[PDB]
Write a protein that binds this ligand. Structure first.
Ligand SMILES: *[C@@H]1O[C@H](CO)[C@@H](O)[C@H](O)[C@H]1NC(C)=O
Ligand SMILES: *[C@@H]1O[C@H](CO)[C@@H](O)[C@H](O)[C@H]1NC(C)=O
Ligand SMILES: [Ca+2]
Ligand SMILES: [Ca+2]
Ligand SMILES: [Ca+2]
Ligand SMILES: [Ca+2]
Ligand SMILES: [Ca+2]
Ligand SMILES: [Ca+2]
Ligand SMILES: [Ca+2]
Ligand SMILES: [Ca+2]
Ligand SMILES: [Zn+2]
Ligand SMILES: [Zn+2]
Ligand SMILES: [Zn+2]
Lengths: 276, 396, 276, 396
């Protein structure tokens, strides 16, 4: 009711715990499962979605509340991951060659971003703070950078000649560009094919959990080299069949949801802060 | 009250001084006082105790005077005195118990039991003599509206309260800024916690404030102030304010910064201590304003630098503390404390005889509820019952 | 916030006014000006965006803060409008023929919406309360309605025969359908080229301003026939040249922003909140 | 105090009664009292103090007695008496001024000036006689801790406060729900405003509650309760709670629904009035709880229906008022009121002689600050200076 203003909340250290709200949340919340195409390929069962829905129903989720979304691969899914369920579980297959992209994908959907437009060829752009990144997304993101000095002359690059621009991204579906802060950079991007946005990492996103299937711990959702935070929403499982993976996800859905929380930026309380 | 105290004091003197072999000159004045008491009480009927399980006792006084003619007291003298003293001590104990279990909203300072009302008559004022106890002295001073004074060791001025305030919070409870405190008895332990360690705070400083409003003014107070709140310095899983969920608190303690403890009276700074720890003196105050700061260490070793990342997740939560103990103080109102037994006496008497809850005190004489809502009527009734309990403990 | 949104805020009626926050707002905000293609065509300058940015700089905005987005026309812009900056000023050209489409676009961008998906092919949908509408967007949105009764049989229509349906929209880019409340309806929509969502108008969107270039006051952002609220964010100007229009927008940017409230910008750029 | 009052009372009686031509039997008792005053005061030296700009004055009393042999008073007798009376009146006025400009934090009820301390000696107690004024009567009664009462027409009990609470808010400040109030002096004007007119509220009812805590208990209070708050019924531009921006208020007044005024003492309900507005009695209370509901009128004429749309923008905001005026009450503590001049006299004397701010009262004797923080020490000092001000106003 008092939207758009922060008020202190006081609580006594002896208030009685409410009962478990897990059953009510499962009843009144939707769960979107994101899996690669090859998972459905290897399952081969036409009615597998219905079977998993019934299994979730045995786990307490009402029929039709759980959604099963499909994506081709990590690179294509990364073009614009749009997660709209209350709870999102993204199954991500591991690949040694795609490690950074995997990280990028995680860094794109495990955190909340406030993104403004970027108009290259008309503005020079700085990255103000640690949280100011440039998120480029599209069919093919190729980004080249020319750092300017205080006199606007490029450093190791000629503003007139784009060919001398230092190159940071080549044919990427998603790329997070972090440049030196306090330096104005001219940018060259395939605007017709990729869009770049000036984004601020506001904070973690709590309704999305990425389960990495096979591999080891490789995700890095923070640009700082000295931190590789393995949060509770980044899980990892060893596998040989996708059916076992899905059965594990259904069986331990309580643990998955416990590691997740309702999107704070969303819902009525966060009204006139950013969204809703 | 003065008459009841005089009876009790005379009896205590008689118990302590009327002993075999003692010079009569040691007791002469006491014997005169005792004989006066006997003369005054002779021929008077009293009834004590008709509330709760307190039994009905009837009291009749027909006693002989003690002799005056001996040079040293002998066994006969002591025995006669002892019989009379035993009866009188029983009567005083029962009158005190009868008064301690009664309360009144209107005139709670005035006597409530029938026996004390009878003893307030002029025909008993002759019994009155040396009123030297702090409680009876305060009673007499309060009657004349002179400034009273009760000295307390570890006064129980703060009602028990273990709560917290979150100034920054989110449903996941992982980037929290706020304060948690225990205000219990004579101690205030307050801790300000920032999960980001003031990474994004202006000038890398997070300000914490804590105001405790005492229900009565305290004077000549000795205070121990220690930098850390050990009560809020260990990992803890805390219920949320509405209790719908629990959150985690993994404190790492940094020393508080710009510690400013103000003791205020009527919202004005009477005493103020800036970065002072150990023993301090608050001469007159009704409020304690503790303001401290979490200052992010400008220089860190690799371990320290690792504790506090630039952004979430924050696994180590920077906490600054403060502990404030009131060792001794003076209050114009009666209060419970660690050394006296007045509250314990009154509560024990009210529990032993199953005294129904009254219109003044909370059930069970709960001290937290009593000092939380310490109203003037509660204060008057409490001073009455505490004075009666101090009179009773002289004999019982 | 959320643990204190339902807590009161108390203020004294003598608290001294703070200084103007306009300069700070411009220093920390982003401005998005939306104009039609004809505007850029008529200006016929390749450095007009730079001119506008520099003029805004004279008006206090930093260099790379004012952004320019072009749309073909009102009907095209209404397909998934994307409001990007903190302050979004839309120069909407007036047409005596596109009146309802102007009103629908203004309704969609000047109010906040909470939208859920509809399955017209399976379920029969009804509009619960006066705020419950249907919003259909697509390349070609044609919507036909069959009202039903408590026995599910249609009235003036047959569920099997779509041809009898009482058509409400044809060849539309954005349409806001408002049917009688409490009546179950069966819908035929071009699901191939049209997406229909069950939406609720939560409230105003205060960071979007609509300047109607030319024309009269014809906007109707409210379905109720008895009310046509003209708000601070529904401006109207008279024009002969687009350069004068943009000069007027730049010069009175103080007044325009002062007529808009910040903190209304969502994390996403959509005109609606999508909830599964 | 009683002696100073007796001096002033004797001087006032002498001024009123020692008049040309009057029977000596009219003044016989007064003449004996006056001569007793002369005899008691003769041979004594007083110094009224030099605090602030108040000049140090020395007083020496060597006066003859007033004659007792006349049958009727004549002009010579009256002038002879008037010389002595004038000197005595000047002395009493200076003593009262010296007392009024002084305060202490320990015994604020005790004399603070040298002259009043000297007058408290036993030798001056002979001067004491009829103590019949309200303030001196209350002074004597409370010196014995007997139940006192001051009667106040329009007691200035509420500290000035013009505030508002918003229960529904957002940065646009165009759909606001809350209350605004002025608690000033003896009046409370409160108003609950809902911008949507309870369009989406359950039952289309918006409940508003306003709680006012009195710093002192009032008894036998006569109060007018009018439905509307004329102070909050016109368009206003109101600062925001943090002062960041302003918001528009465009009230349209609807009659409050289910009006319930509770008068409470120590959290217990003493008086309760429902949908009553003429004149009500609150017999004993320290808190006022006002409940009033905005009920959306189910039936509306086209104009009324137009004013209240189903959804935003809301331009005519439904406001329900309330006005509570305490016309008369009784308080056991001294209070500023509309009729008495005690506060004005004390403030005037402190301002005229530029008295430095003391440790007890707020600067300038500001009544809002005083009544906000009405502590027992402040109450004692205030009763002392108010009794002295009344004694002074008997003469000046
Ligand atoms: C909570 O759980 C307890 C224990 O099973 C049960 O008595 C109660 O009905 C439950 N619901 C509520 C609302 O307390
Ligand atoms: C506000 O404006 C006043 C007057 O122009 C000026 O003195 C002051 O420094 C400004 N800043 C603040 C923070 O009040
Ligand atoms: Ca990549
Ligand atoms: Ca180069
Ligand atoms: Ca950077
Ligand atoms: Ca890293
Ligand atoms: Ca249309
Ligand atoms: Ca038809
Ligand atoms: Ca409808
Ligand atoms: Ca309309
Ligand atoms: Zn001890
Ligand atoms: Zn919480
Ligand atoms: Zn406000």
């Amino acid at each position: 009711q008092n939207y758009g203003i922060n008020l202190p909340i006081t609580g006594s250290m002896d208030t009685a715990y409410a009962n478990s709200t897990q059953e009510e949340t499962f009843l009144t919340s939707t769960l979107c499962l994101y899996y690669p195409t090859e998972a459905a390929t290897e399952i081969n069962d036409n009615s597998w979605k219905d079977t998993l829905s019934q299994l979730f129903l045995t786990k307490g989720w009402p029929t039709g509340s759980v959604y099963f979304k499909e994506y081709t691969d990590i690179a294509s899914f990364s073009v614009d991951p749009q997660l709209y369920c209350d709870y999102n579980v993204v199954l991500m297959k591991y690949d040694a060659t795609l490690q950074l992209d995997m990280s990028e994908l995680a860094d794109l959907i495990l955190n909340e971003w406030l993104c403004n437009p970027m108009d290259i060829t008309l503005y020079y752009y700085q990255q103000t703070d640690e949280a100011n990144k440039w998120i480029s997304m599209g069919s093919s993101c190729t980004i080249k950078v020319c750092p300017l000095n205080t006199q606007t002359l490029g450093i190791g690059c000629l503003t007139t000649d784009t060919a001398t621009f230092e190159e940071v991204a080549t044919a990427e579906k998603l790329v997070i560009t972090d440049v030196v802060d306090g330096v104005n950079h001219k940018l060259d991007v395939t605007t017709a094919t990729c869009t770049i946005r000036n984004c601020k990492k506001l904070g973690p996103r709590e309704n999305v959990a990425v389960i990495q299937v096979g591999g080891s711990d490789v995700l890095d959702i923070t640009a700082d080299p000295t931190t590789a935070p393995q949060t509770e929403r980044m899980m990892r499982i060893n596998w040989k069949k996708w059916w076992q993976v899905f059965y594990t996800v259904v069986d331990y859905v309580n643990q998955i949801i416990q590691a997740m929380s309702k999107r704070s930026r969303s819902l009525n309380s966060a009204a006139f802060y950013y969204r809703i | 009250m003065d008459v009841l105290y005089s009876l009790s004091k005379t009896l205590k003197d008689a118990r302590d001084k009327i002993v075999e072999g003692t010079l009569y000159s040691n007791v002469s004045d006491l014997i005169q006082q005792f004989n006066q008491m006997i003369i005054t009480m002779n021929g008077n009927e009293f009834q004590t105790g008709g509330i709760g399980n307190l039994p009905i006792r009837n009291w009749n006084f027909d006693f002989g005077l003690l002799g005056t003619t001996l040079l040293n007291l002998d066994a006969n003298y002591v025995e006669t005195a002892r019989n009379t003293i035993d009866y009188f001590v029983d009567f005083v104990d029962n009158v005190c118990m009868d008064e301690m279990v009664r309360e009144s909203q209107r005139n709670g300072i005035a006597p409530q039991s029938d026996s004390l009302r009878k003893l307030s008559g002029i025909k008993f004022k002759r019994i009155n003599f040396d009123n030297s106890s702090e409680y009876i002295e305060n009673w007499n001073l309060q009657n004349r509206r002179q400034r009273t004074g009760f000295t307390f060791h570890k006064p129980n001025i703060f009602p028990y309260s273990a709560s917290f305030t979150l100034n920054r919070s989110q449903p996941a409870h992982d980037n929290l800024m706020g304060t948690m405190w225990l205000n219990a008895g004579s101690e205030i332990q307050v801790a300000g916690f920032d999960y980001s360690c003031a990474i994004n705070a202006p000038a890398n400083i997070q300000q914490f404030e804590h105001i405790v409003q005492l229900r009565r003014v305290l004077t000549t107070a000795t205070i121990t102030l220690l930098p850390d709140a050990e009560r809020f310095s260990f990992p803890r899983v805390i219920n949320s304010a509405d209790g719908a969920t629990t959150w985690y608190f993994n404190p790492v303690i940094l020393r508080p910064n710009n510690v400013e403890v103000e003791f205020l009276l009527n919202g004005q700074i009477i005493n103020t201590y800036q970065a002072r720890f150990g023993t301090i003196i608050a001469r007159n105050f009704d409020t304690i304003r503790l303001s401290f700061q979490l200052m992010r260490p400008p220089n860190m070793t690799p371990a320290v630098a690792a504790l506090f990342p630039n952004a979430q997740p924050f696994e180590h939560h920077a906490t600054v503390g403060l502990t404030l103990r009131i060792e001794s103080a003076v209050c114009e109102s009666v209060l419970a404390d660690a050394s006296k037994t007045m509250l314990a006496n009154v509560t024990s008497v009210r529990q032993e005889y199953a005294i129904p809850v009254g219109p003044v005190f909370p059930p069970g004489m709960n001290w937290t509820d009593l000092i939380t809502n310490y109203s003037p009527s509660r204060e008057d009734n409490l001073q009455r019952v505490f004075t009666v309990a101090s009179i009773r403990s002289m004999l019982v």
